[PDB]
């Protein structure tokens, strides 16, 4: 499967440039962007980036440019939606690239 | 007793409790307790912390005025 | 309250079927907690172990493995039916020990007759820092 | 209850659980943290540990040794370095199959045997070793060695020998004996030996145990030595048409400053390296006896650390204080040396390629890309455990009450300001290198690859142009005979630097375009990040406005619950944990771009990476797909060739990546759950209820969570860039 | 000096079953070591 | 009217209409200039 | 088994007994609150650690504070 | 004639790619009947392509290699070869905008802060009151500056939010 089925196919995608398929490609890229762009929300927690938050609401209050609505990081669970609903749309959108430009180029 | 225990009540006050959510922070005293608590001095705030709560009580040594 | 209750084994238990999440080994081998309640009339109610159970009109008798299922059946009760039941723990030799109402007024309250314990009498965020207590088995909060 | 197992904590001995397994083994070596313990105590667990440690080390390398003598060809790599493949270990499997056998039998061995990427063979040929014998009294030498520092632990460990507090406090003498002991007579000694043996065994004549005392590395014979006449011994170097095992076109000489690199073997020549290594002795030595000992002459910690305080309130307190802050915590110690020794080590990496310091390294190309990927990530790692350290520093041992106004307590009074400051910075560089890679991929993918933007990196070319490189033109230093650096040393080390320096075979001062500018910007980006999430964390180690009382939770603890809002990952621990992947991107970034400049640069394509490392198609495609072809083809239906062990520990490593996805993302309520429901199905089953736990099975801890998924993450990430670089640059070259 | 031919098929198997056995054994007791 | 002002004077609705607003000056400076790289006046 | 400690920030609102789900915490009399309350702990065995009592603390930072650490069979909240 | 490259114009593989480009276009191109709509669409593609390459030539864009321009960043060495248009020019540019972009931002928050409620005209937006400060901030860097004048820009070490150490 790595070799004959996932290496031996999306050589189209990746060749797609310069083509009528290289959106395929790009939409390739941005699902492989947004899938590790998950991870971040999937894996850390929320006291790290609320303690990173209120460093730049330090910067912000020093220029006083501090918004009257307090920014605070997401939930728990709103990061966990958040990371899941990215790692879906990026593997999602990795395999619906691929298998169109294969099945395009090709077939 | 004479006088009041601590600052009149609606002044604007800044805490200078360095633990608290609200430090180097201006808030609106609502009430003093005069029976004699560690803190007497009840202070609302326009914004809530991370817990949701605005009101909080602070002893006379942690209030200023608001500079 | 005046006098602690003593628990029952001959009570009834509720009427129930055969429970999944019960008392595992660790009650013949630990200690297990039992609450009892008594109930003014027939009911259902919901056992936080499983499903539902009718408790009978008289004294009522459950048993568990966690104290924690105890307080979650007792706040149910009192909050649903105001039933104000009682555990006891049960250990594996026979002893028995009173553990949620200590004083029979529920924590709630205060009956002026508890010596608060583990309370530090300075504020928050005046501990010492740990460099202060080191190699000396003393936490900054224990002091 | 209350087992054996963990002697070093009471209170982890009373825990009926399977966690005491765990926790007995992630806190073994915590000293601080154990039940009554002292300083004098601690001190001697870390004289014991440390001796521990070099036994180890020294029996590691006796057994690499012991390996390469015996199942290796160093006699033949010697006699032919060019051709045949160093040999690391022989292969003994029974689950071996015929043709697996048959396939893993190369560089003319009896066996299967493992093709050797370390280096050793290209350092031991450098060095002077020659014979198989050489190799194995070295290793036998080296486990003797090992023994006894393993003996003098237990010694150093037992009573009426343990030292004493302030033996271990006297900084002032140790710093004395390690800068001119353990650095001064030591490189003094390893250039007497390059002079004695190397320099001769380069030059065709042996050099052994047995004819030493006789032979003469100098044909003067120490005499300009004392009469001060030290340029005799550069008067015959070595010649261009020289070889490294014969002795056609030597020539007397041991120390001089012919810089530049062997024609022959396209290293560095030995007597520059003996002359270094001889200056670095005489430098470590004048300045090892700085710092005030018994004696009445020498150099006070304190009284320079209190004296170097700018005036007029520059830096408040200035540096007082800091001498019993480093002292008392030991932890500031361990971060300062894992520091340096991480800068220490990424110099090394970027100077080995560039620089290649062994004979037939260069060609090598496998050897060159494991040994930089090596040192790179070993880098990073202590990069990190200094940050984590001097987090664990801030947490554990700071008192602001000591270092009151100092350079500590300011930058613990601005901390807010460093960390925006880092913030911006990885913001800045992350949006913009996104959006210039993004934007050059969309106007690849269009057909029209001319709109895209390519930022010349003009100051590297300019350093690089005023360092001696002609390519790029220009009128500035090393490029100009008027200029007064190309005057001075005109006929010292110039002429042989100016060829090194514009030839393109080599990797030094490699042509660099705009991907090389993209992929730099990158870097930075990644560093720069890497440092924001690390300061943070050692920052507001010690209380944050979230948790003011960080302090008093300890350095590792999972969170404070749901409360005001959610408290997980607020550690330094924490911080410490998601900059390990911050560090493991970095690092895969900068040795994607070493691999990929370098493959380039062998297969003689450079114009294929000036033109692709542009676009991340060009990253994925021409770099990730096209050098991976011959690396999955190690095993297939159709037979099997020799990087069938590379595919299968690729495959290897993405499954512990996936394993360590499994224990990153799921937490810990889901798998109690589900342990508490088979200890139910193990209760009330019958035939096998018999049986019971000593220990109640539990869930991993939320930081044995985040430990354990960041084990399985780690090493699957060094085994699947380790096969994908390995099979790629020694499945097409030798 | 050189060691002998059945070097690979006696070490390999004693330090791939034998020692690692034996090392299990002894931890599986010290865990389960009870006063 | 007031209340439907309201509503358009949301965070939402003055992100949209920027949205457009920008998107289209750039759509129409680029069809305008087709594919311009530096600054020639 | 786990630390909790109670400090004189406490108003006696008695939200953390409440907020409780193993009756660790109690109000004994007190008099440097108004409510003439005080929290205490006399049964930190049973303490699990879950925290509950700190999210509904009314006061800033925190009036009540458990660390974890020597976790039992009572404290790992185990039914076996 | 920087960083050893030739101008786009004198180079011949700037030549080569505009010729493979015509190629692949004309190829697209003959597969169409000239009375067809995709044939003047390919036709503009095919005039704007040679309008972009003549406008990125005589402009003294260089390339190195490969026929892809390369841009200068360093000023002084683009003032010296006209190569300050490349980026030197839109970085300033860039930077009135972003600086406009920070007054129109910091002059909303300061000017919806003295008034009940801040966190709803925070929410919903004084659509006037945006407006007008959008077509006041034509002249930022010059109330940037007198705001730092005055001390009005930035905020005192004492009324500031503060972290514990
Ligand atoms: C000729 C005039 C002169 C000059 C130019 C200096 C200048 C300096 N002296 Mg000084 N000195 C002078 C006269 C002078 N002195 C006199 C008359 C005396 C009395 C004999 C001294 C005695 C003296 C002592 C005893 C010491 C100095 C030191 C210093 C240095 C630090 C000063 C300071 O407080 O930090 C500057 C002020 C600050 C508030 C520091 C801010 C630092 C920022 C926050 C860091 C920003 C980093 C940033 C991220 C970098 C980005 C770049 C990116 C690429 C990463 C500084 C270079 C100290 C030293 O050796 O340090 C090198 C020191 O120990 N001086
Ligand atoms: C490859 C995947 C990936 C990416 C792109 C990011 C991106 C980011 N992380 Mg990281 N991170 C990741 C994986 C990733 N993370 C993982 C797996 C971990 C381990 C858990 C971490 C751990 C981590 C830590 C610990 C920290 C970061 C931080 C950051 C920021 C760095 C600042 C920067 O470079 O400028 C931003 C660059 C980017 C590429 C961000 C993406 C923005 C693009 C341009 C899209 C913007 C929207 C776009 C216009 C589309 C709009 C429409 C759309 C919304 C529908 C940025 C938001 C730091 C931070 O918060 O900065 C202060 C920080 O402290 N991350
Ligand atoms: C000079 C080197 C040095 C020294 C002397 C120490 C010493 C210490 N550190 Mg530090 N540290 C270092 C380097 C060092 N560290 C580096 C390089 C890092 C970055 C990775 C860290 C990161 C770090 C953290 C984050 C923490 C420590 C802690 C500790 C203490 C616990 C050690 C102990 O007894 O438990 C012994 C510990 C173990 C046996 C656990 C090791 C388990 C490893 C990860 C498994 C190996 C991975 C993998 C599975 C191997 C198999 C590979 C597979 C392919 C086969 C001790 C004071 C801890 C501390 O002070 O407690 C508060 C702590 O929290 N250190
Ligand atoms: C000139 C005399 C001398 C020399 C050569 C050494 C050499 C050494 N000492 Mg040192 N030491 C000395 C005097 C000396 N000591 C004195 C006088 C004291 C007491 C004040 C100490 C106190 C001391 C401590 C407390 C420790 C050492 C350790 C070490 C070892 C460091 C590891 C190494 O080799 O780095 C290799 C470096 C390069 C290859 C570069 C090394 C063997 C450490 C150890 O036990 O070994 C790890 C250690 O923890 N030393
Ligand atoms: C089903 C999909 C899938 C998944 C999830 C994985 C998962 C993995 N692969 Mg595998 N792979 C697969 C299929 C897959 N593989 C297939 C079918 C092939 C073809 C044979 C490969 C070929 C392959 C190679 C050749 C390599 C991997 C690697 C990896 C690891 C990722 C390393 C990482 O996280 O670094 C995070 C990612 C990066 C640091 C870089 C991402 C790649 C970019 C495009 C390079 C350009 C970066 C450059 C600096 C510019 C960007 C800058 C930025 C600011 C924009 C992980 C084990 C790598 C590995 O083992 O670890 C390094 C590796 O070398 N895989
Ligand atoms: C590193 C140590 C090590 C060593 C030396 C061996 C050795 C062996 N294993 Mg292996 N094995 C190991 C670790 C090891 N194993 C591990 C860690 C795993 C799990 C991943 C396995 C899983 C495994 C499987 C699944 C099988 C083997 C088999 C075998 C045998 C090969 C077939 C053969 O000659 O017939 C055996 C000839 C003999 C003379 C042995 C009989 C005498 C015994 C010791 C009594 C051989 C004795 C095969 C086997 O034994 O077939 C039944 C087999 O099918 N192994
Ligand atoms: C952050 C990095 C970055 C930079 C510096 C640029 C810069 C540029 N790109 Mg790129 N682009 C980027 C990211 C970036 N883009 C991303 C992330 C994408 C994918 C969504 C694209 C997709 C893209 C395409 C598809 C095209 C460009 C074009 C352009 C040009 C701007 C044309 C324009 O807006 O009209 C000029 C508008 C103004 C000057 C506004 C003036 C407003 C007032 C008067 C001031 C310029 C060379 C176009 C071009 O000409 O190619 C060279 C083009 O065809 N880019
Ligand atoms: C810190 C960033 C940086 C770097 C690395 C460079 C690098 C360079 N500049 Mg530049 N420069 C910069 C910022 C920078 N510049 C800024 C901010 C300005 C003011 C706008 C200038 C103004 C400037 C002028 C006026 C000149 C240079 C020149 C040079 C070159 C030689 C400089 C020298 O000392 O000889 C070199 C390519 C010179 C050049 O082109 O080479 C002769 C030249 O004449 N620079
Ligand atoms: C217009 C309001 C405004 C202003 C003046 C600032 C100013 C600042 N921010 Mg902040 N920021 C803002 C909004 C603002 N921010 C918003 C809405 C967010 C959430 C996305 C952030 C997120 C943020 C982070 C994460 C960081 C900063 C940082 C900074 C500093 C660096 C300057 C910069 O460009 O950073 C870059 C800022 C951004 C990329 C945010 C841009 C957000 C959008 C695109 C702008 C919104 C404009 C707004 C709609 C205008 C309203 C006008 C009104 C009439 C409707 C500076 C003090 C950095 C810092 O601490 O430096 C010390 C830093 O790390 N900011
Ligand atoms: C990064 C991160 C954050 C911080 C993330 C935050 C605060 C959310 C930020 C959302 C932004 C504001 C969305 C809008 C972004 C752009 C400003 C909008 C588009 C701009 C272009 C159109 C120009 C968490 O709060 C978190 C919580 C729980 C688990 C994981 C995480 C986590 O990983
Ligand atoms: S680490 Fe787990 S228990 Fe702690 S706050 Fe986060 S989700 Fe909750
Ligand atoms: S929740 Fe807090 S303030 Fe309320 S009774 Fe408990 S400790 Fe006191």
Known sequence: WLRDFLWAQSSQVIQSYGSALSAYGLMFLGAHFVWAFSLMFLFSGRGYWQELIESIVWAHNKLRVAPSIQPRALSITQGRAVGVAHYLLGGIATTWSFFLARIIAVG | KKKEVGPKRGSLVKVLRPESYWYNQVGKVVSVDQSGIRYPVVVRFENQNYAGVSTNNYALDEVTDPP | PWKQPELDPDTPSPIFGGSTGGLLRKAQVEEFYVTTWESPKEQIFEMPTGGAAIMRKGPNLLKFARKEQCLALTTQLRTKFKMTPCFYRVYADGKVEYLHPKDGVYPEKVNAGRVGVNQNMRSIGENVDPIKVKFTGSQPFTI | ATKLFPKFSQGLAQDPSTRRIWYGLATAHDFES????????????????????????????????????????????????????????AIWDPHFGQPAVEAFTRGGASGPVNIATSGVYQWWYTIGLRSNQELYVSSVFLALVSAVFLFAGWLHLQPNFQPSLSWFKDAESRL?????????????????????????????????????????????????????????????????????????????????????????????????????????????????????????????????????????????????????????????????????????????????????????????????????????????????????????????????????????????????????????????????????????????????????????????????????????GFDLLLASSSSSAYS???????????????????????????????????????????????????????????????????????????????????????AFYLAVFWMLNTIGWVTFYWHWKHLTLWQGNVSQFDESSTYLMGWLRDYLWLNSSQLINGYNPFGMNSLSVWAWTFLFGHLVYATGFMFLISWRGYWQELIETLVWAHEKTPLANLVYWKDKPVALSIVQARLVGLAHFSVGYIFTYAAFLIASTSGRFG | FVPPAWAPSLFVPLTGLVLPAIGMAWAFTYIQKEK | MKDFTTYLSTAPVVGLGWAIFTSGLLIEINRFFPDPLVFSF | AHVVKIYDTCIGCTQCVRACPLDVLEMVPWDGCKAAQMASSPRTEDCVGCKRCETACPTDFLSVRVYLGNESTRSLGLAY | DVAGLTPCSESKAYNKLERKELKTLEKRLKKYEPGSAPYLALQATKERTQNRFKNYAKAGLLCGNDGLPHLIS????????????????????????????????????????????????????????????????????????????????????????????
């Open chain 4, 34 to 89: 154990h039940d009554g313990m002292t300083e004098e105590n601690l001190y001697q667990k870390i004289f014991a540990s440390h001796f521990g440690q070099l036994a180890i080390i020294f029996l590691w390398t006796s057994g690499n040794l012991f390996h390469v003598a015996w199942q290796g060809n160093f006699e033949q790599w010697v006699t032919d370095p060019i051709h045949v493949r160093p040999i690391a270990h």
């Open chain 4, 176 to 472: 004395n004996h390690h800068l001119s002991g353990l650095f001064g007579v030591s490189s003094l000694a390893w250039t007497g030996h390059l002079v004695h043996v190397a320099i001769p065994e380069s030059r065709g004549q042996h050099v052994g145990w047995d004819n030493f005392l006789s032979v003469l590395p100098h044909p003067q014979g120490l005499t300009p030595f004392w009469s001060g006449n030290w340029a005799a011994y550069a008067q015959n170097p070595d010649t261009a048409s020289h070889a490294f095992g014969t002795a056609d076109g030597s020539g007397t000489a041991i120390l001089t400053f012919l810089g530049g690199f062997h024609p022959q073997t396209q290293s560095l020549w030995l007597s520059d390296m003996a002359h270094h290594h001889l200056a670095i002795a005489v430098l470590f030595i004048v300045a090892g006896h700085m710092y005030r000992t018994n004696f009445g002459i020498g150099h006070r910690l304190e009284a320079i650390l209190e004296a170097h305080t700018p005036p007029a309130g520059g830096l408040g307190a200035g540096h007082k204080g800091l001498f019993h802050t480093v002292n008392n915590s030991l932890h500031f110690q361990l971060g300062l040396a894992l520091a340096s020794v991480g800068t220490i080590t990424s110099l090394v990496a970027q100077h080995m390629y560039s620089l290649p310091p062994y004979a037939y390294l260069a060609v090598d190309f496998t050897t060159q890309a494991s040994l930089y990927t090596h040192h790179q990530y070993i880098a990073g790692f202590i990069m990190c455990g200094a940050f984590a350290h001097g987090a664990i520093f801030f947490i554990r041992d700071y008192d602001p009450e000591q270092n009151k106004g100092n350079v500590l307590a300011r930058v613990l009074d601005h901390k807010e300001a460093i960390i925006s400051h880092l913030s911006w910075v990885s913001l800045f560089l992350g949006f913009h290198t996104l959006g210039l890679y993004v934007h050059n991929d969309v106007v690849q993918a269009f057909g029209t690859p001319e709109k895209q933007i390519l930022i010349e990196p003009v100051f590297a070319q300019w350093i690089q142009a005023a360092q001696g490189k002609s390519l790029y």
């Open chain 4, 488 to 574: 001075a040393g005109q006929s010292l080390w110039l002429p042989g630097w100016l060829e090194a320096i514009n030839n393109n075979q080599n990797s030094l001062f490699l042509t660099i375009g705009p991907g090389d500018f993209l992929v730099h910007h990158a870097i930075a980006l990644g560093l720069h990040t890497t440092t924001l999430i690390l300061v943070k964390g050692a920052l507001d180690a010690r209380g944050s406005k979230l948790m003011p009382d960080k302090k008093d939770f300890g350095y590792s603890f999972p969170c404070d619950g749901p409360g005001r809002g959610g408290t997980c990952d607020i550690s330094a621990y924490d």
């Open chain 8, 74 to 165: 360093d000023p002084g060495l683009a003032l010296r070869f006209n190569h300050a248009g490349e980026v030197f020019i839109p970085t300033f540019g860039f930077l009135y905008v972003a600086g406009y972009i920070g007054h129109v931002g910091r002059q909303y928050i300061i000017k919806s802060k003295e008034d009940a409620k801040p966190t709803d005209k925070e929410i919903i937006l004084d659509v006037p009151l945006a407006l007008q400060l959008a077509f006041q901030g034509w002249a930022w860097p010059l109330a940037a500056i007198q705001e730092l004048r005055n001390g009005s820009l930035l905020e005192k070490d004492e009324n500031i939010t503060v972290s514990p150490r």
